[PDB]
Amino acid sequence: LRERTVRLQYGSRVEAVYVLGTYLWTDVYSAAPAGAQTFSLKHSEHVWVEVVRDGEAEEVATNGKQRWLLSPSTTLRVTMSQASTEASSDKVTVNYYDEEGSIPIDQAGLFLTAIEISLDVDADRDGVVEKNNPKKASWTWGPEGQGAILLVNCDRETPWLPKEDCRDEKVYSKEDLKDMSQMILRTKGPDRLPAGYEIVLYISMSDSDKVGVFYVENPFFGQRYIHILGRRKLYHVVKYTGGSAELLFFVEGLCFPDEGFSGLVSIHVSLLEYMAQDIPLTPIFTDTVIFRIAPWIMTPNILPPVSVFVCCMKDNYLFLKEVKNLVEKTNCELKVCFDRWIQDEIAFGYIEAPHKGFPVVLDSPRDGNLKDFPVKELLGPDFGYVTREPESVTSLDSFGNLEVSPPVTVNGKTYPLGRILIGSSFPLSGGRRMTKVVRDFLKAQQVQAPVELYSDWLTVGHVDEFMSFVPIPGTKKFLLLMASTSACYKLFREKQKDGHGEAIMFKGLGGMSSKRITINKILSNESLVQENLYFQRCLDWNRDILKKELGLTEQDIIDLPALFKMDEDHRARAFFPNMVNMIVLDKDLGIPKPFGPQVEEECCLEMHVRGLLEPLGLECTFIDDISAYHKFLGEVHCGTNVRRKPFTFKWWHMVPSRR
Amino acid sequence: LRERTVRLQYGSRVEAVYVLGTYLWTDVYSAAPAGAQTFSLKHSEHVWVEVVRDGEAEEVATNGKQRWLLSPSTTLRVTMSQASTEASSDKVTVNYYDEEGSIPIDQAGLFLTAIEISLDVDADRDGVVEKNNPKKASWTWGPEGQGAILLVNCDRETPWLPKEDCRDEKVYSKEDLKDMSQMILRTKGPDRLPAGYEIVLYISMSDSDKVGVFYVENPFFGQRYIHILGRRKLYHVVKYTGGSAELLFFVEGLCFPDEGFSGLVSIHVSLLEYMAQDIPLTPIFTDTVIFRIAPWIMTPNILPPVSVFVCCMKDNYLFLKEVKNLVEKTNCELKVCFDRWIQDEIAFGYIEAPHKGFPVVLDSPRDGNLKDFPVKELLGPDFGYVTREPESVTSLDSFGNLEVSPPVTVNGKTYPLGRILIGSSFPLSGGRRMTKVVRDFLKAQQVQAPVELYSDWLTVGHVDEFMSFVPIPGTKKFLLLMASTSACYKLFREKQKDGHGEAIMFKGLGGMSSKRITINKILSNESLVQENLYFQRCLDWNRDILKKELGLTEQDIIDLPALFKMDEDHRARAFFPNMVNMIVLDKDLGIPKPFGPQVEEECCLEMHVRGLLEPLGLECTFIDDISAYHKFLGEVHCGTNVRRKPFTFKWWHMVPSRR
Ligand SMILES: [Ca+2]
Ligand SMILES: [Ca+2]
Ligand SMILES: [Ca+2]
Ligand SMILES: [Ca+2]
Ligand SMILES: [Ca+2]
Ligand SMILES: [Ca+2]
Ligand SMILES: [Ca+2]
Ligand SMILES: [Ca+2]
Numbered sequence A, B: 001l002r003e004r005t006v007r008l009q010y011g012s013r014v015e016a017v018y019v020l021g022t023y024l025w026t027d028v029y030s031a032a033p034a035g036a037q038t039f040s041l042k043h044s045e046h047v048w049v050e051v052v053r054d055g056e057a058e059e060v061a062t063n064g065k066q067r068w069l070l071s072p073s074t075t076l077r078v079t080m081s082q083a084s085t086e087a088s089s090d091k092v093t094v095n096y097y098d099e100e101g102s103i104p105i106d107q108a109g110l111f112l113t114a115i116e117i118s119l120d121v122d123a124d125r126d127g128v129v130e131k132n133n134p135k136k137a138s139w140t141w142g143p144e145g146q147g148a149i150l151l152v153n154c155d156r157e158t159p160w161l162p163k164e165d166c167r168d169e170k171v172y173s174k175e176d177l178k179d180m181s182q183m184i185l186r187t188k189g190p191d192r193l194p195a196g197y198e199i200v201l202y203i204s205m206s207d208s209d210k211v212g213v214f215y216v217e218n219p220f221f222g223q224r225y226i227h228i229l230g231r232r233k234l235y236h237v238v239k240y241t242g243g244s245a246e247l248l249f250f251v252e253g254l255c256f257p258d259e260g261f262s263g264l265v266s267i268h269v270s271l272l273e274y275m276a277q278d279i280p281l282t283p284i285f286t287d288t289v290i291f292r293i294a295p296w297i298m299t300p301n302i303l304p305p306v307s308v309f310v311c312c313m314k315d316n317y318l319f320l321k322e323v324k325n326l327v328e329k330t331n332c333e334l335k336v337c338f339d340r341w342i343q344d345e346i347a348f349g350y351i352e353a354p355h356k357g358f359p360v361v362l363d364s365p366r367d368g369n370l371k372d373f374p375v376k377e378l379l380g381p382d383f384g385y386v387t388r389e390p391e392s393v394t395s396l397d398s399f400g401n402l403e404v405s406p407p408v409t410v411n412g413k414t415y416p417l418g419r420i421l422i423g424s425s426f427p428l429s430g431g432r433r434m435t436k437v438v439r440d441f442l443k444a445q446q447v448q449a450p451v452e453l454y455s456d457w458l459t460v461g462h463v464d465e466f467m468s469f470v471p472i473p474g475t476k477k478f479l480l481l482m483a484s485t486s487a488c489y490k491l492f493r494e495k496q497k498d499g500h501g502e503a504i505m506f507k508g509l510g511g512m513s514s515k516r517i518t519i520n521k522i523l524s525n526e527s528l529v530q531e532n533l534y535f536q537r538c539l540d541w542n543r544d545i546l547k548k549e550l551g552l553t554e555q556d557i558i559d560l561p562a563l564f565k566m567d568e569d570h571r572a573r574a575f576f577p578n579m580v581n582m583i584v585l586d587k588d589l590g591i592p593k594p595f596g597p598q599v600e601e602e603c604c605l606e607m608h609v610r611g612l613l614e615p616l617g618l619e620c621t622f623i624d625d626i627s628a629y630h631k632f633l634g635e636v637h638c639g640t641n642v643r644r645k646p647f648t649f650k651w652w653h654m655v656p657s658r659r
Helices: A174-179 A317-328 A436-445 A485-500 A510-515 A519-523 A526-550 A604-616 B174-179 B317-328 B436-445 B485-500 B510-515 B519-523 B526-550 B604-616
Strands: A002-005 A014-019 A022-026 A038-043 A048-053 A056-060 A074-079 A090-097 A106-120 A148-150 A181-189 A197-202 A211-217 A224-229 A235-238 A243-253 A264-273 A282-293 A305-311 A333-337 A346-353 A356-363 A384-387 A402-404 A408-410 A413-415 A420-424 A451-454 A467-471 A478-484 A557-561 A564-566 A572-574 A583-585 A588-592 A619-623 A639-644 B002-005 B014-019 B022-026 B038-043 B048-053 B056-060 B074-079 B090-097 B106-120 B148-150 B181-189 B197-202 B211-217 B224-229 B235-238 B243-253 B264-273 B282-293 B305-311 B333-337 B346-353 B356-363 B384-387 B402-404 B408-410 B413-415 B420-424 B451-454 B467-471 B478-484 B557-561 B564-566 B572-574 B583-585 B588-592 B619-623 B639-644
Touching (some): A002 B526, A014 A264, A014 A282, A038 A048, A074 A090, A106 A264, A106 A282, A148 A243, A174 A243, A174 A356, A181 A197, A197 A224, A211 A264, A224 A235, A243 A282, A305 A317, A305 A583, A317 A333, A317 A583, A317 A588, A317 A619, A346 A639, A402 A467, A408 A526, A420 A436, A451 A526, A467 A583, A478 A485, A478 A526, A485 A519, A485 A526, A485 A557, A485 A604, A526 A572, A526 B002, A557 A604, A583 A639, B014 B022, B014 B264, B014 B282, B038 B048, B074 B090, B106 B282, B148 B181, B174 B356, B197 B224, B211 B264, B224 B235, B243 B282, B305 B317, B305 B583, B317 B583, B317 B588, B317 B619, B346 B639, B402 B467, B408 B526, B420 B436, B478 B485, B478 B526, B485 B519, B485 B526, B485 B604, B526 B564, B526 B572, B604 B619
Parallel strands (some): A002 A022, A014 A106, A148 A282, A305 A333, A356 A384, A420 A451, A588 A619, B002 B022, B014 B106, B148 B282, B305 B333, B356 B384, B420 B451, B478 B557, B588 B619
Antiparallel strands (some): A022 A074, A038 A090, A090 A106, A106 A181, A181 A243, A197 A235, A197 A264, A211 A224, A211 A243, A264 A282, A305 A639, A346 A356, A402 A420, A408 A413, A467 A478, B022 B074, B038 B090, B048 B074, B090 B106, B106 B181, B181 B243, B197 B235, B211 B224, B211 B243, B264 B282, B305 B639, B402 B420, B408 B413, B467 B478
16 A cells, blocks of 8 residues: 555645545644644544554544644554445544643544545456556566556458558447457546545657557447547546446557557556645645557468469460469468569568557658659558558668568577568668668567568569478478579589580570570589579578577578579679579469470479478469560569468567566 | 588688687598499597598597498588697698508598687676686576676866767776776687688677777887777777787667667677688677677665755845755765755766766756757766767756656566656546657666656646655655645644634745734635646546556645645646655655744644654754845755665666567
8 A cells, every 4th residue: 555645734724636546644633733742533433543653553533532642753654445325424534622621622533435446457467457467567478477568559340541550549340349458447436526636547748759648438329439538638537427337448559569669558547636726736646547559460371371362464374374273272361463562572470469459561762763653542440550660761771671471480599480580781882771760660570570681683673583491291390481593503514514515494484495494504604603503602601690590400491492693783683583582372472484495395493492392391383473474584573472370479478578 | 510511622621710619520531532342531639530421420549440321411520629739730631542442542631620619798797707618609597697887988087078988989098998888809819810810809790889999009109998899890800919808899889769669789709700801701700709799777765965055145044044054964975066056957877887887967958949969067987977868858858857757566576666647637538648769768778667647637747746755764665745726724723722813824934014914815716726636636647657657545645735726727736845855865855845824933834744744753954045145935045856876676687578
């Protein structure tokens, strides 16, 4: 119990509200007539009174005759365990006596109205709002941790509105409330608060753009939703009802954790006392709850697939047919839009709270040269949206440059949600780097602990050009897949030795035929050999940082043959389609068709890749996205992205490193 | 050891630097002629080589004949434990064989130069730079914690320069180096780095305004100081010397922890490899150290006094005489300046690192109406300076409004440095509050965990108007001292009852004589009674928050008689000098002379205060700062501030709550 100072008043009796969970220390000396010697006291049945002399306390009966010497160091401790009702007269009365005679010379009194006031949230994270969790004012990480969680309400309930639900101060439909965390103000007391008191809910100016709080009224003509705290509303005076009462509120987050915002917000209720005109009201009692806003979490390739989103031209038939075929071997749904934007402009992620969770799309920054407008078209009920706006964005801001590992353990530290991977350039290089605003956002989510890789040796500059992850069927394990030019050169040299040097690349692509590219022609190009040795140095630098930061050994890695060509900037583009960027649906892999040299009427790259993957139980389907274009220049014209189930592990059970 | 990828090259031999503390995994397959079957190897004495087949490793002799099948999954692991010298030929050579015959058909080789590179700091916090502390790249709090500490070098070595040492990129004198943390780059190797390598120290753009790093050269004409990292210098190419070498650097902090800056900074060294023209150099190896910049720490009244700074008019003689007398009972030095600025504009604090610490002044923000210019006049050798500049500052930005408690324990949580206290207004009041920039600064130091009190009921608005702390002599304990109007009224009512109602206030102040203020006149003023009842409510609200946030009981508190008068804003100013704002030099207290009612030719306020304090072993000296002015209007014309020894407890041994 918290101790509160309430003094009797020289002359006038004192009337005070007492909040359960506190107790009063009471000065009886200041109220005594000068020259009074001793005091006695009476009290009612529901008021417990102790006389405290220099720290030693003595319980006192309701009607006794006992007297004590008046001293500033002799005081009362006053405690009540139950709220007042209308039938209550709760009081303590003190009588004062002079030296001569046992009849009181004066009297001072304290008239009490006891009320219960508690602002309650689901701090124990079970989805139900418990009564006054002792830990509700704190937020701690881990399995044993406590404190309440809030979703950014970033989806859209109502289609005609252009923006996410949280962009305004209004609630249109009851469905919206299911995305919100419940907060209950529980009170117990008599019919009315005594004169001069009111109960007020409030938030800080700083948090006013992080939350909104709604109350549901049920007036005559239907249910309505009142915005009581949030943008440009810092406080709300609460209408008090007597007896045992509860007021239910619904709380939405407006903003994800970011640079300069930890994700923690607070809401308070105070009992205020009116003093006089032109004087602030005094906060007699204050109760506080904390919320943490849930982070955006990215889903790695190893999580179960739900939906496969695909963008291509209407007429790329082979691609559509083969992708349809692949998805039909799974339980996934196929969604087609008739152009890589679904892959480059969108990162699929999710948010979760004990009471609810939904997928959330992160939308890549607009440059204004290429992407003028944001992509909001996926925004819908229980499909959320978030974006960050930097200046000047480069290709490394594309989300082909954003990947996430499966759960890993590194030097004994666990990353149960995996770690986000972002391509970058060397510190002293003066090269390209993802914009600070996006990097800061990803870092602030904290639970995926991002790692920067080296992508800037590639023309386009995305990590998805050189690496991916696949699960190992029938196990809990996974593999890192790396592009390898050394594997490609070894394979082509073997085929040449075997008498296949005249085997031709790009068979069936009519726009490449005049080039007549053979194994011999590739192996005899000396400058191309040197370029690819250099690109292998770039791959191996990444291999090392991945082994270090993901805790991987060589046993966890498979190398897929790849080949690149250098541009004027000494950066790489694919010579033939990059097989590492593949659709991963559990055991079934859609792999870009390489169009490699035919040996015995089978592509030697396809056969080699099958020989690497199939023994592990992975099933390979090669998907041709380039035939419709008759040639391959290093560009990919289709994109896919897979929306997956969230991790079973709850993010709040993690313990991220101290910042 | 960290694993690094190095492949043999098809055709050409490979030459590489090997950094001790790493090891190489080596691809021998890519270098083999097509159609080669098996391989063998030789190696020199200081190179350890294992053949690894699918995870299983086998040690191999220097000159053996053993062969293994060529496979991509059969590789080498290469490890060196000692640096190369000039007499070293460190190498591994691989021979390739075809199916028919045991004579090698080709050979590939790896020529190695092993070097040691370590960037070392005193992470174990003993003041000496240990060799490669495994924890040097992290910073942890507490007794068991590790990682290196940096002072903001905010003092001034050289008087003609206007600003603090850290405001530039130059070091003028060797004395400055003693404020700096040492960082040693230790290397071991042969006479030169092999062609195409260089060693580079670097920092991030973000940290470039947080640190500077100097190197001392001893050329012909004297010692000089070179700025190698810091503002507008992000990297430095290191001149390599062979054998075992050390380069000593000195590091200074430029900035205190603040909003948006945790206090942590990093410095790196990398071994870079030259690839070609117009291509970035590759970071072959990188080593990192972290520093935490030491927080500004405020000294509470219970710490041993060193120097007493005093500001008054030349002619306030009684004050000077009495302050001189008081300080002469102690071992303290008295410093006088011939006006409260030393009290209002200055907060005495300190910084500490394992190798050094000094006092540091925090200078109150300039408004431009009253304080136009900063006070730098105390800036000197081992006396540092820091300030923050907000807009719009109010009286609550004055450091009379900044106090710090003695060490306390609250709900089982220890605050070994005490907690900073700042006066404020109620959240919904629209009242005054210390500027955000200063509040953010104090919060960011973290080790004093600030608490806001309610000062805005006072005209001036400072916590030093109503409260202070004193040690209890002969113990480890302390008392909170609170102004009390209830104590004053009780005392005056007793004196009136005793026949003293005609006793006069302000005796000897000629400018007050016409007012003829008596106990009777004070007690019969009904509006003044109501005002002071209200001010006691304000004091008691503070009493409650102090008991809660400092873990205090009523036994820890003494109430000194005080009286206030209300202004137009319903704010308080002292009716007679506030005794709570006192000079605390251990057992000896300089207490403002109250000029209370004389009873038997002694001030009844002085006698009462002595009766409260003297039994505890505290010695009271009443100090008259107002007689020189002939009257008291509520304003104080002198100021003092005491510079104290720092806490014995080291701040880095604390474990502050997670942010
Ligand atoms: Ca619950
Ligand atoms: Ca809304
Ligand atoms: Ca919603
Ligand atoms: Ca929803
Ligand atoms: Ca050391
Ligand atoms: Ca300097
Ligand atoms: Ca210095
Ligand atoms: Ca110095």
